[PDB]
RNA sequence: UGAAGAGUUUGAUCAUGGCUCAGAUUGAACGCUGGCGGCAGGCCUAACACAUGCAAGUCGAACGGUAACAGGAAGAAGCUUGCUUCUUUGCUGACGAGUGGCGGACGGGUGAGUAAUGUCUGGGAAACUGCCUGAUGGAGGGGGAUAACUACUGGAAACGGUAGCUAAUACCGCAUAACGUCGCAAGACCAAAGAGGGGGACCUUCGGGCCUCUUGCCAUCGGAUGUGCCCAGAUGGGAUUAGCUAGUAGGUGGGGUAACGGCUCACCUAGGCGACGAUCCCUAGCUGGUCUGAGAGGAUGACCAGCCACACUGGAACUGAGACACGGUCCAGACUCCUACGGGAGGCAGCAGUGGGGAAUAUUGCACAAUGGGCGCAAGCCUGAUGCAGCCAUGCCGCGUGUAUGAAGAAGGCCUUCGGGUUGUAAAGUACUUUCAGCGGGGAGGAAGGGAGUAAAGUUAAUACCUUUGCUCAUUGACGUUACCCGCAGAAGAAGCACCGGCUAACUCCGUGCCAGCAGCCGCGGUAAUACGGAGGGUGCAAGCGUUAAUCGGAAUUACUGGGCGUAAAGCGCACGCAGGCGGUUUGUUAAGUCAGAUGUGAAAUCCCCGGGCUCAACCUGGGAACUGCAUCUGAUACUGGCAA
RNA sequence: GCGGAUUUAGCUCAGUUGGGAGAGCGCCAGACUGAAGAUCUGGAGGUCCUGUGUUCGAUCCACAGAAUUCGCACCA
C-alpha cells in the first residue's frame, strides 16, 4: 500500500523522525511525539530482542518507501554479485526514482518527494514517467518540465533544500530545474545508523 | 465420410485389383519354372526363365517389385536354376 | 443452424382458461389450424414432417406457449394458462402476463369454481380484458338456455370489477369444429376480430431499464443455458451484460442472444414472449423467482412498511379479525415468500375492511422498489392489495 | 522436410523473429534444424538484433532450401 | 559468493529420540475483501457421453466441357427504334459438376495404455528416403479404354442398374538400351509426358506444321535432408514373486522384408535362461528438464521443446517414398440415431461449445493485416495452425487511491487516583496537485510485399516470351480512434484482511464463567481471562489478506557427503562353511582399473559470466562460459587389478 | 412449477386424535471445596414444526405455509 494515514504518530514508537511531515515542524512541535501510540493497546517497557530484530529491518526498508518483495529482490542480486554484499543492497535500494528526487531538493517530505512523480510535473531526459521506480544512473539527467516550473508546490519545497546538504555525488541545480546524477551514491557516510550484518543474519535461513 | 478427396478410397480400388492380377501372373511363372525343376529339365524351367525375364524387369518399371527389392529380385529368382545346374 | 424472425406487427399476449371441462385444450389446438389456412400458408413447411413432439412434452397447460403468430391484424403470442386447481398458483402471474383472456366457458355448465376466481383474480392484477365463449352449442340446442346462461356471465363481469355491459359472445362447440364441422370455423375467423373489438391495443414502454419474470430455465441439448419470459419492460438487445437480480442470489452473467423460438430476433421489447442465452451460469444455480434486469437496477430488501387495503368477505376475503402473528403469503411478480403481519403502535387487531399501514418482515429479501404492486393470499385467498409504501432495508 | 523460414520468439506484442533453418513437420517454434539469423521488423537497435549468416544461407541452400520476403529484401541491403 | 535455529518428555538435570513451528514452492482449491494497467498461466477428475457450427483442399497452366454469372459475336426483335428487348453461340472473361495430379500420412489434441530392440546416453551396420538438390543422358512410335455426357430405368432417402459415346501429363503395348540391372564369365533384359508464351522466312486442306523460349516429364549415377534397423549402457517398486523356456536355444538349408534378423518355415542338434534376481506380482507414458535445496540429494514431469503412444471397441487389409490414414475403407461387436419400416447412418483424446463427474479450471467471439503451413511453373485460393479480442485476482510485475500546512489539540468516542491519558496533524480548518479512472480531441508504428507502367547490361527471333534490375505510380493494418500525445473539470471515483498466552513483533476495558467457545503444537476457560466474546486500542501485510491441501527444506531424524548397536532403538544362543567381499612380502611383465593429453559429442530451451532492448519493472534479448557427462583416438606406469617368478 | 410423508420438555420417546400433556435421561437449584463428582436435600422442565379455520373447547379434525426427506415435471 502507499499508506495515506499518520505520518508524525509512527515517530512515537520510532524513536526517530525520519522526515515525518518536515517543512516547519519535526519532533514535539505542535503534536505528541516520542510516546507510545496506544493507551495501554501498547506502552513502554523494556524491549524485547525480538522487537528490535523486527524493527531495524523496516527501519532500512521504510526510508525508500519499497514493498515486502522488492527489497529482498535486491537482496538475490547483491548476494549473486561477488562484490560486498552489504554495500550492493544498498546501492540498489537507492536507484528508486521517488529518493533521488528528495535529494534533489524536489519535495520537503519523503512522501511529498514520491507524490510529486505521480502527478505529471517529473520527465528524466526527455522522457516523460510518472513511474516512482527508475533505473537511475550515472550521467543520467533529472529535469523538471515546462508545466513545473509553473506550479507553486515546486518552489516551496526548496526551501527546505537550503537547509539539507544535499548529495555530492549528485550535481543539483535548481536555478533551471535540473541536476544531473553524475556518479554512484556514497554510504562510506550513510552508514552511520545502518548495520548491514543484523539484517542479512535475519534474511538467511 | 467428408473428405475432400474421399474418391481416393474408390481410386484405389482399381490400382489395388490391376497390380494384384500383374503380381499373380508373375507368380504363375514362377510356379512353371519350379515346375521343370522337378523335372531335372534346363529345357522347360528355361523357357520360364527368359520368358518372365522382361516380365519381372518390366514390373520393376512400374515400380511393382519396389525399392531395393527390385535391384535383388533380378537375382533372387536367377538363384533358382542355378542350385538344379 | 438456426432461422430469423423480425418484429412485425404488435405482439399481443392471450390465452386459454376456465375451469375443467369446457373447451379450453381443444379450442387452442382448433382455431390456430382453422386460422392457418385461412391467414397462413407456405410451401415446403417445416411443420409437416415434425408432428408434433414438441407440444405435448414442454407443455401441458403449464403456463405457456411458444406459438407465435401473426395474423393480418396484429400480431398473436399465446400462453395457454392453467385452469386446473393444482396449478391456481400459476394462473396469477399467467394472466398477469396477459392483455386479454379468452375466458371460455362452457354454456352447458354454469359459472364453476375457476370461472369465478378468475375473473377476480384478473380485475387485481392480472388480465383487464375477458372475452366470454360459451362452448357447447352443438350440444345447447335451444336459444332459451342460452339467454338465460349469458345473463349469469353478465352478472360475474359486472361487480367482479369489469365490465359486464357487453362482451362480444362466440357460442360455439369446439370438438366439433375442427374435424370439419364448418359452422363453426366460420366464427373462429372473428376471434381476430374480437382481438381488437374489445381490447384493441395495450401500450407499454420499452424505453424503462430492463424488468423480466422466469418462465422456465432451460440448459439445452447443445447450446448454453437458457432463461425465458415475456419482457415487462424495458429492452434487451443481443450481445448485452445483465444482472438478475433475485431472492437470495444475486448473479451477474453476459447476455449472448435474444431467440424467439429459435427464429432470432436483435432485440427483445416488451409485450414479446421470447427466448434469452446466456454465457456462463447452469441451470441449478438459476433460481425461480429471480427477475432478470440491467446492471442499474434496485437491491433487495426485507422490510419495509406498506400501505395495504384490507378487503371484505363478500367479494372474497378476511372474515376474522386478526392480529400480529400470522403468516400470509405475499405475491410480488413472479413468485411468492412469506412474510408477517406487524404493526406499528396504535394499531394491534385489524378488522375485515380496514386500511392500515404495517411493517413487513418477508423471510427472504426479494427485490424491492417502492410503490411495487403486490397480492396478499393466506389459505390461498387475497387478505389485501397493497403496495410498497417506504422500503427499508 | 527443412526449409528457411522465420519464427517468433517474442512475446505478446513484441515482434522478435528469429531466422532459423526448421522443420515443417514439426514447426517453425517447434524442432529446430539451426539458427541462421535474428530479425528486427521493427529495426530496433538492440546488440545483434540482426544477424543473417553469409556460410549456411550460402551452403543449406546450395542443396536447397527457400527463405522469405523480408530476408529476400535483406540479401540487397547488406549488400552480401 | 557458500547451509541458522526455536518450542515441545522431567520436581529439577544431562543425554538419547519422536513430535511441532518459523523457509521456499503450486496447472492449486477454499473463506473474506476487491482501483487500475502491463507480462504469463488457466479440465490435473468421468481415456465419461456429446446438439451444432467449424477445423481439409487446390491447381483449367493435363483433361473432355459449359451448369450459373458477365460480356464478344451473331442473327433478330421491340422497330419499347440506333436505343431498350428477345433467342442463338464455349467465342471471351469465368466456371458448375465430372475425369487427372498433389495435399488430406501434416498440423492439432490426449496421456488411457506403457517398465518397455519404448525412452534417454553413447556407439554401430546390412537400409530406405516422395517433397529437396548436383551431374550426364533421354523424352521415339503405336494401340485399347472409360468418367462426364447421353438415352432409358430402381428406390423414402442413402444409394443404384442398364445401353451408347469420348479426352488426357490416365491405361497398356511396341521401338530405342548405359556411367543401367542381372549375370563369374558369355551374354540376356527394362523407360517414358507433355503442356505453356511468343514469333520473323516458309508451308496449311488454315485447326496447325515450322522456329525460339519456358515449366513439366523419363532414365542412370551422386549429394542433401528426413526416416527405418542393430547394439551397449542407464531406465520404477515387491522373494509374504524361485524356479523359467519349444521357433525355446542353436545349426543347416528354403522363403520373406527396403534392409540385418527364427521375421517365418522344413529338417537337424538338445540346448538356452536363472538369486550379478529369471519367472511372476503391484504401479507408471518417457526425456530435456521442472520444484525445492548450500551442496549432495530428494521430490517431480503443468505451460515450452523433443521423443513415444492413442483416436467408439476389437480386428484387418488397400494405394503410396510415406497410413494401419482422429475428422479414409472394409469386417465383427456394443452403443447411438433415422426411416417410406424395405433399409440405412454415425463416433469431439481437433477448436469453440453441450450435459454428466469433480474442490476447481474461461467465448459456439474477430480476422488473413502479419508470421508459418498446404495446393499451383504464377496469379490465386485454403488454414479452430496463427495473430488478436474475450472470460478468471491463477500467478509475476508497475502505478494509484492525494500532497503540504493546521492545535491547546474540535466535538465524538475509548481508558482514567479523575490530574488526566489515548484516538491525534488524525479531523475540522487553511492553501497546494490532478497521476490514474471518467469526458473531449489528435495520433507514430507494426508493411515487407504484391499490382499498373518503364530499364535489361541476358536468352533467342536481331525482335518476343520468360526471367532480371533499378526506377515510376495507386495502394496492402484484422487488432482499434494501438503505443503515445494534448486539452477538460474536479479529492473528486478508488482499502481491505489477519493477528496481538509461549514458540513469535504486537493489550486494555468490559460480558461470559472448565459453560459458551478457542486451539499448528505446547495448550486455554471452574465469575478480578494480555489465550473465550464484544468494544476500544495496538501490530503485521496490503488490492489483496488469511486458511487448507500438496512437495522439498529445516530434519545430519535413512546418514556416499552425513548415523547407531554394554545399559537409551539395535549384535543371530554358539560354531562350521559355499557363493561374495577382503589379501604379507620381493622381483619381472601387462596396462584392464587407474593417471595424462587429444577428438568428437554433450539439441534448442534452462542456469551462470559478461551485456544490451522495451516509459521502469514484469517481460524481451546478444555473446561467452557452463554443457559436471559419455564414446573414440594416442600416450603414462606410481598406485589397483591380471599374468609370471 | 406439481404430488406424498413426516416434526410432542434441552436430549430419548409415549399420549388424546373433538376435551384439555407424561415417563426415562438430562438439567437447574439449596448443602459440603472455588467448581464438579461421590454423595445429601430441595425444585423446575412443551408457541405439541408454524400460521389460520370450526366449536363452549384443537397438540388431535380441516386448510395454508416452513423444513426435512421421497417420487414427478423442463430444452428458448
Ligand atoms: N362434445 C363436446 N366435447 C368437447 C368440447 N370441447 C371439448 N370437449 C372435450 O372435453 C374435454 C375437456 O375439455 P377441455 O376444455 O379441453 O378441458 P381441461 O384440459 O380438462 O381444462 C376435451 O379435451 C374434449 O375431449 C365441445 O365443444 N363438445
Given at each position: 500500500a502507499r499508506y495515506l494515514g499518520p505520518?508524525?504518530?509512527?515517530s512515537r514508537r520510532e524513536?526517530?523522525?525520519?522526515?515525518?511531515?518536515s517543512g516547519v515542524r519535526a519532533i514535539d512541535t505542535k503534536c505528541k511525539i516520542?510516546?507510545?501510540?496506544?493507551?495501554?493497546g501498547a506502552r513502554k517497557p523494556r524491549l524485547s530482542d525480538y522487537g528490535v530484530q523486527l524493527r531495524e529491518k523496516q527501519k532500512v526498508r521504510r526510508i525508500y518507501g519499497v514493498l515486502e518483495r522488492q527489497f529482498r529482490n535486491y537482496y538475490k542480486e547483491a548476494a549473486r554479485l561477488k562484490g560486498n554484499t552489504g554495500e550492493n543492497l544498498l546501492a540498489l535500494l537507492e536507484g528508486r526514482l521517488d529518493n533521488v528526487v528528495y535529494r534533489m531538493?524536489?519535495?520537503?517530505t519523503r512522501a511529498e518527494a514520491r507524490q510529486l512523480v505521480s502527478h505529471k510535473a517529473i520527465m528524466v531526459n526527455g522522457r516523460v514517467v510518472n513511474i516512482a521506480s527508475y533505473q537511475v544512473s550515472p550521467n543520467d539527467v533529472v529535469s523538471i518540465r515546462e508545466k513545473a516550473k509553473k506550479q507553486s508546490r515546486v518552489k516551496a519545497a526548496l526551501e527546505l533544500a537550503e537547509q539539507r546538504e544535499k548529495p555530492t555525488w549528485l550535481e543539483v541545480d535548481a536555478g533551471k530545474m535540473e541536476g544531473t546524477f553524475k556518479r554512484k551514491p556514497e554510504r562510506?557516510?550513510?552508514?552511520?545508523?545502518?548495520?548491514?550484518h543484523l539484517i542479512v543474519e535475519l534474511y538467511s535461513k | 465420410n467428408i473428405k475432400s478427396a474421399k474418391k481416393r478410397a474408390i481410386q484405389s480400388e482399381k490400382a489395388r485389383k490391376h497390380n494384384a492380377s500383374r503380381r499373380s501372373m508373375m507368380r504363375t511363372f514362377i510356379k512353371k519354372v519350379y515346375a521343370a525343376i522337378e523335372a531335372g529339365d534346363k529345357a522347360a524351367a528355361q523357357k520360364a526363365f527368359n520368358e518372365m525375364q522382361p516380365i519381372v524387369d518390366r514390373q520393376a518399371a512400374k515400380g511393382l517389385i519396389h525399392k531395393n527389392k527390385a535391384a535383388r529380385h533380378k537375382a533372387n529368382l536367377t538363384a533358382q536354376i542355378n542350385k538344379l545346374a | 443452424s438456426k432461422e430469423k424472425f423480425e418484429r412485425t406487427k404488435p405482439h399481443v399476449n392471450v390465452g386459454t382458461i376456465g375451469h375443467?371441462?369446457?373447451?379450453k385444450t381443444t379450442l387452442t389446438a382448433a382455431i390456430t389450424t382453422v386460422l392457418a389456412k385461412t391467414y397462413g400458408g407456405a410451401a415446403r413447411a417445416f411443420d409437416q414432417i415434425d408432428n408434433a413432439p414438441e407440444e405435448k412434452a414442454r407443455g401441458i397447460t403449464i403456463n405457456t406457449s411458444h406459438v407465435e403468430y401473426d395474423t393480418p391484424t396484429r400480431h398473436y403470442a399465446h400462453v395457454d394458462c392453467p385452469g386446473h386447481a393444482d396449478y391456481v398458483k400459476n394462473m396469477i402471474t399467467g394472466a398477469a402476463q396477459?392483455?386479454?383472456?379468452?375466458?371460455?366457458?362452457?354454456?352447458?355448465?354454469?359459472?364453476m369454481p375457476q370461472t369465478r376466481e378468475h375473473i377476480l383474480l384478473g380485475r387485481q392484477?392480472?388480465?383487464?380484458?375477458i372475452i366470454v365463449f360459451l362452448n357447447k352449442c352443438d350440444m345447447v340446442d335451444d336459444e332459451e338456455l342460452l339467454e338465460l346462461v349469458e345473463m349469469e356471465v353478465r352478472e360475474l363481469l359486472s361487480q367482479y370489477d369489469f365490465?359486464?355491459?357487453?362482451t362480444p359472445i362466440v357460442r360455439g362447440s369446439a370438438l366439433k369444429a375442427?374435424?370439419?364441422?364448418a359452422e363453426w370455423e366460420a366464427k373462429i375467423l372473428e376471434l381476430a376480430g374480437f382481438l381488437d373489438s374489445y381490447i384493441p391495443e395495450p401500450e407499454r414502454a420499452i424505453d424503462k431499464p430492463f424488468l423480466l419474470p422466469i418462465e422456465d430455465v432451460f440448459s439445452i441439448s447443445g447450446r448454453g443455458t437458457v432463461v425465458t419470459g415475456r419482457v415487462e419492460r424495458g429492452i434487451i438487445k443481443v450481445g448485452e451484460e445483465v444482472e438478475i437480480v433475485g431472492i437470495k442470489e444475486t448473479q451477474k452473467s453476459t447476455c449472448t442472444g435474444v431467440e424467439m423460438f429459435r427464429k432470432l430476433l436483435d432485440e427483445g421489447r416488451a409485450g414479446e414472449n421470447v427466448g434469452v442465452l446466456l454465457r456462463g451460469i447452469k441451470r441449478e444455480e438459476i433460481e425461480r423467482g429471480q427477475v432478470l434486469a440491467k446492471p442499474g437496477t434496485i437491491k433487495p430488501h426485507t422490510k419495509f412498511e406498506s400501505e395495504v387495503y384490507i378487503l371484505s368477505?363478500?367479494?372474497?376475503?378476511?372474515?376474522t379479525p386478526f392480529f400480529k402473528g400470522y403468516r400470509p403469503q405475499f405475491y410480488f411478480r413472479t413468485t411468492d415468500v412469506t412474510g408477517t403481519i406487524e404493526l406499528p403502535e396504535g394499531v394491534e387487531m385489524v378488522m375485515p375492511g380496514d386500511n392500515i399501514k404495517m411493517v413487513v418482515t418477508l423471510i427472504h429479501p426479494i427485490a424491492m422498489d417502492d410503490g411495487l404492486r403486490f397480492a396478499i393470499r393466506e389459505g390461498g385467498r387475497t387478505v389485501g392489495a397493497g403496495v410498497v409504501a417506504k422500503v427499508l432495508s | 522436410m527443412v526449409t528457411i523460414r522465420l519464427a517468433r520468439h517474442g512475446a505478446?506484442?513484441?515482434?522478435?523473429?528469429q531466422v532459423v533453418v526448421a522443420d515443417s513437420r514439426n514447426?517453425?517454434?517447434?524442432?529446430?534444424?539451426?539458427r541462421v539469423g535474428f530479425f528486427n521488423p521493427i529495426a530496433?537497435?538492440?546488440?545483434?538484433?540482426?544477424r543473417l549468416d553469409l556460410d549456411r544461407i550460402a551452403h543449406w541452400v546450395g542443396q536447397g532450401a527457400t527463405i522469405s520476403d523480408r530476408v529476400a529484401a535483406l540479401i540487397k541491403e547488406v549488400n552480401k
Open positions: 505520518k508524525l504518530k509512527l524513536g526517530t523522525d525520519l522526515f515525518l511531515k516520542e510516546q507510545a501510540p496506544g493507551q495501554h531538493g524536489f519535495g520537503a562510506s557516510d550513510l552508514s552511520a545508523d545502518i548495520n548491514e | - | 375443467v371441462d369446457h373447451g396477459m392483455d386479454g383472456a379468452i375466458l371460455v366457458v362452457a354454456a352447458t355448465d354454469g359459472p392484477v392480472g388480465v383487464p380484458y365490465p359486464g355491459d357487453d375442427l374435424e370439419g364441422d368477505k363478500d367479494e372474497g376475503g378476511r372474515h | 505478446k506484442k513484441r515482434p522478435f523473429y514447426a517453425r517454434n517447434g524442432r529446430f534444424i539451426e530496433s537497435e538492440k546488440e545483434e538484433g540482426t
